[PDB]
Amino acid sequence: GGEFGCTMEELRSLMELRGTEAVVKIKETYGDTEAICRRLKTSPVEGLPGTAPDLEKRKQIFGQNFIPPKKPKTFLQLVWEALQDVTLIILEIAAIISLGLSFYHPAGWIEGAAILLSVICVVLVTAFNDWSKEKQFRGLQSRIEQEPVAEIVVGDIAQIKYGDLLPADGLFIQGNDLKIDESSLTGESDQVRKSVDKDPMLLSGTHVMEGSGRMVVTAVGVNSQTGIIFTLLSVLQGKLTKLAVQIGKAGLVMSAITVIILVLYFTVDTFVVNKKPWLTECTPVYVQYFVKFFIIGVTVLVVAVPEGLPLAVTISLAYSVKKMMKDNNLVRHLDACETMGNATAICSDKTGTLTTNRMTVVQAYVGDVHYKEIPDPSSINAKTLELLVNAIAINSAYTTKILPPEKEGALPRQVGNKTECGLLGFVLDLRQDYEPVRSQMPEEKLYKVYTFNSVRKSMSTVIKMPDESFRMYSKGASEIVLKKCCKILSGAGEARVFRPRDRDEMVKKVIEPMACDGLRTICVAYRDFPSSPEPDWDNENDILNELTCICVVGIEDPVRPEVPEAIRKCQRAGITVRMVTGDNINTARAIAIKCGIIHPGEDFLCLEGKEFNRRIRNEKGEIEQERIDKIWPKLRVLARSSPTDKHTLVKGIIDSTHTEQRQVVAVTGDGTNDGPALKKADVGFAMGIAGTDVAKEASDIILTDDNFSSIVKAVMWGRNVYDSISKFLQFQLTVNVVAVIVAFTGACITQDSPLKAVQMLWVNLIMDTFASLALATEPPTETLLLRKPYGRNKPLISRTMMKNILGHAVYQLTLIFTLLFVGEKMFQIDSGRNAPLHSPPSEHYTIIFNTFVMMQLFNEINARKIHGERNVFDGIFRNPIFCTIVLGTFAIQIVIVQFGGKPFSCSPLQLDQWMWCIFIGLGELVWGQVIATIPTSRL
Amino acid sequence: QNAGFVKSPMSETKLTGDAFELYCDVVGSPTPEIQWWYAEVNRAESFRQLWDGARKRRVTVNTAYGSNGVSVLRITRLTLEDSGTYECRASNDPKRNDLRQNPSITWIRAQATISVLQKPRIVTSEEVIIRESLLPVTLQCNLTSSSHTLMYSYWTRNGVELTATRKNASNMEYRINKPRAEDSGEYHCVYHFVSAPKANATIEVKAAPDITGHKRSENKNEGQDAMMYCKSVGYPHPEWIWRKKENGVFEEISNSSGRFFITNKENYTELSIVNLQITEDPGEYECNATNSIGSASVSTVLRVRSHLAPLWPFLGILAEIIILVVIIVVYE
Ligand SMILES: *[C@@H]1O[C@H](CO)[C@@H](O)[C@H](O)[C@H]1NC(C)=O
Ligand SMILES: *[C@@H]1O[C@H](CO)[C@@H](O)[C@H](O)[C@H]1NC(C)=O
Ligand SMILES: *[C@@H]1O[C@H](CO)[C@@H](O)[C@H](O)[C@H]1NC(C)=O
Ligand SMILES: *[C@@H]1O[C@H](CO)[C@@H](O)[C@H](O)[C@H]1NC(C)=O
Ligand SMILES: *[C@@H]1O[C@H](CO)[C@@H](O)[C@H](O)[C@H]1NC(C)=O
Ligand SMILES: *[C@@H]1O[C@H](CO)[C@@H](O)[C@H](O)[C@H]1NC(C)=O
């Protein structure tokens, strides 16, 4: 075109064509990669230095980074979808029929209004709750920014950045051996190299592991092919739904029986005995009687239906996730929150979890003399000290330069190379500064670059000394390079020849005990070469062997102070924790013993991995799932294990059938190769500030502090959710067993329910909408970590909940029946029994209603302890919603009894009867105290 | 001053078998001896002196001597012979006692004519006792002798005109399809004429008393008033008597301490007590109502509330709190 010669559509169509078909586009049209840069108004060396004013001038096509993907949620719509539940439609149908009858009555209409409350107060809580939870999830996931320094940068050229999902696209400008993973993109897990001309193109949705090269950014947003691909598009819930359906069924049966009994009794009384002929003006009274009986039946149904059980689960979970966001645990899948409560095993990693990763060197074998403590600067000969300092300084990389802990006194900043900080520290431990010589040493004859080969694992630097004496230096694993030695320094600065007699028990006595102490030993190597001529840097065979060992240093990273208590607490709660390190077996055993996982003197299984592979694999090289079943239950420490073996281990534990209880496992992981490992476990923990995004995206819980104790804080909350629901359930069931068996029995005798319909709707409103908010939000105690995990096979209604329910229903029933039958004599008040139709509200049917509501209110407090606790008031002040709800209910109760009158069929009460009602209420708590004195085993 | 009329009676158009009065009031200066002059209906020239006691005491004249001459004529047993013109004249002549003089003495003209037409006769149906029988009851009254153009007629009960009872109805009928004690009362059939006084007559309908409404029970705190009542319907209206139950039988109540107020009306019987004492006042009372036909009764129960009521439940609450806290602290 004109000012924009290369449009966004042209580059999009270029990217669409890939493979060999793309070759003609790579070599022609836009020349080469430098020509592509010239068309992008960039340069192959710098491109765009990130200058803000240059925005909207070079590309002017970077619309947006699709930060809000869909957000298709509106408050009325959430209300509408929450309104579609079965229980809510039952209540709405009940309201419709009640109001329809009331309009054709020839007060009354009040019914509908009241039950409408039990609709609205449910539909508004859940919808806005879901909306708020969604907003929180948007607020915490968007903060995940891995920078590649800005949120979105376009028109720039960047080097390889491995370990991160590629957000951009575009062919790589220049490079070799470029290797990317396209596992989940195209369904092919095979790694495919990026050829220079055949297939140089790169696309998003791909996880890069290793390789080299440099690429350019040609992506903006959804316009990328990865976005185009997507733009084309709980075991507790089951048991709760089962219980809800059964309760509703029983309620329906009871309503049918009650209405049948009432109408049958009335008709038989009116016609079989009285024998009154029907008259054309006598229909309306029969109409009124039938309407009243039907309203009674409808409200007896509506009370028994649990329209508050669905609300309790959502309230509990949405409170729990928010509190977990402040306890160093970020949750992205709601299942994990409750699943983690039943976890029965945890498989963890040594580094990053059980170690602070502040590695320092403790012991040192220098000049044939061993120092357990920190060496003095002058304790060893100064000659050997300066020689080793010069060697380590020229060996170290320039880039590594101690940046003081970024905050300092708050968080350390051991630069890049982890171990190197330890070695650099040892430099200053000898009162010798590293930076002087670091700056002093220039670019010498830099054969150095051994590229840290995978097999050798040696950081090697071969250069000339300032006196033009060429020498090769090497820093590697002590045991793999120990045999590649021919001389050793002494205490007097003498190169004593390394002999097989020296390679004897002396070296092991030097190194192995420190490994049993928990220290990883790294040695110092350097082979000298003649000053004239220079060594053949092509002849690398002799340069990597027969070096000279200066000293061996034991470097170690201490365990965090808070993990022994945490793992002890976990082992108290029945959760056994294994260990998968991937390092030397002896060191892993040493650290595990002092971490509390493994105690001495007890039979336990620790494997090196090779024998683990031998035992797991059969003769043909497959998995039999039988030989493994005798290994895992005693296995604790697995050392030098590839990430591929962790997946087989978790599969073997989670699919085993030897034990009666299915093992629920939760394995941590942060490396790039652990995808299947997290995915196949029940819940995957991913480390936040020390983990690759490949592990983070394929997980369920993300730890912010990368600490093991936070795991426990996610198993204390996970159990609590369950308990919350349980206690709520208890309360509601009690009320049902005392409401229904009163409306059925009362109407079986006195031809009218002692509680009329509006009163029953008020009782339902309490027990099914305010109980959920009062009892669902209970913050956890520390005792939840003292009981064994439950498992999937367990009834909802525990054995002690039945004891509490029956024990309190007996008391409520005996008191209400005694009141209804002989309460006209105790209080010395006019009877109200067998009242005629349209009678004024009596003062004998208000004491019953008031005692019933007060008894429920003072049993809501007693419902909070489900395990047999006696101090029912323990922690009642930790929850303000509970106290607010109870006191608000009490105050509204008083105002509607006093000022109710005709609509609520309640007459005002004198001050003598109120204190008797509250006396019975307190008697409720005392009976609750008594009932806990009966062992459940005898029954 | 000259003789000026103050209150001049209007002409009378009365009927037979009745009695009426004429009221003449004139200021006199000097006050004359007030008498009356009588003339025939067809001739007003006659000036016969009128004096009480004539015609066998059928007409009586009373005159008050004072600042204002006031004369009242009462005529009883009206017949066709009572039609005539009566005149009251006031004289301002100081020498009025000189009766042997010319008729030129000062006089005034205040004539009033009286006419008599036939008395109305109404024949009414006999008295009816409403029993529990469902047979409709018909009340009849017949205007058997009216000399005058009838305007309209209507039934009334207890002075209240019944709805839709106004037609011509020279003979009028009222039917009760479902006679009840609430229907019984003093019925009348009033006959309104164009220029004649109304005739009412009487048919009383009797029934046993029925108690309509009452307080089923009464509760009050000690040292406070108490009111009880018992409405009733029926006719003729019954006598009332209150009573109190004691040792299983009814007994008369006595003023004694002077706290009982018993107000009686046609219906309604309010009994009021003041400064109640729990010692004897609680119990049950009864309001007997007795009529000529029968007696109806209903009972009420009154209980007084001691002012120390709230104290006991408060002790109960404290007992519960104590026995709760003791157990909770002993638990630990
Ligand atoms: C009824 O009608 C008759 C016939 O005209 C008449 O003489 C009599 O006065 C009437 N009575 C009324 C209008 O009350
Ligand atoms: C009373 O009046 C009714 C209605 O006109 C008549 O039938 C009846 O004969 C009358 N009775 C007498 C006694 O005049
Ligand atoms: C009719 O007049 C007489 C006159 O003595 C009176 O007693 C009676 O009450 C009157 N009727 C009504 C209904 O007022
Ligand atoms: C009782 O005496 C009082 C005081 O005089 C009086 O008001 C009251 O009416 C008397 N009781 C009765 C039944 O008359
Ligand atoms: C008697 O009772 C009636 C019906 O309530 C009432 O309206 C009326 O005023 C009472 N009548 C008398 C005469 O007291
Ligand atoms: C009311 O008093 C009368 C007085 O004669 C008595 O005979 C009668 O029994 C009493 N009424 C009732 C219903 O007992």
Ligand SMILES: [Ca+2]
């Ligand atoms: Ca309900």
